[PDB]
Amino acid sequence: MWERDRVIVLGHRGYMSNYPENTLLAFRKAVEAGADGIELDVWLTKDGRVVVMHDETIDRTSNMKGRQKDMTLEELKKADVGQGERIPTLEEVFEAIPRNALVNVELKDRDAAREVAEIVAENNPERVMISSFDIDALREYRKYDDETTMGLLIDREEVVPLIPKLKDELNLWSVNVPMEAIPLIGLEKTLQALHWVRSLGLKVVLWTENDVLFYKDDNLAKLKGLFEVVIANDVVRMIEYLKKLGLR
């Protein structure tokens, strides 16, 4: 399911450019706009529920304050996360979108690993990908699920040398890396790094801050053929760009 000819487009926290991030509304809209799937962030509540929130706290996206790890689900459901949307549980999300929609669950909380794995098992795990910046979260997830597709998010240069070992340890499908690499080490070195990871047998998932580096200098086009998935805030804009390049 993650291995396919057509480049995969995921809405970052749903169609977050046009709808409130990490909401059922945003998720539905992304898929309704033609995205292959969604990406989202999860944490474990004080009562053992898996909830969708990017930040460690609800302050930025909600009308309320607090750390979700320190709240119950019921407390959490008080909040307004945009346009009357409530913070969803992971199960709520699977219910909301098609059964074959791709879902990249980003584990923000190692404590959530076991629950996430159980829910995933019940919800067409073949279309699921687990990723994290936190290697320990990934290691914990592997205690409970050794089959589901896994990606390593990277934003530190020093992590890169570790990739071969991590791949073997975690059985990674992909590394999930930022367009920010280009201004950082230059396009050519970025191309070389991508070749390196591919030489390991890894696939590649691309992301950036607020979609800006995908389009600047036509950076994304330069990477043609070296990536299998893109995570984008503006789903439609990304789909249009890919069509223009003959990739959609």
Ligand SMILES: [Mg+2]
């Ligand atoms: Mg995320």
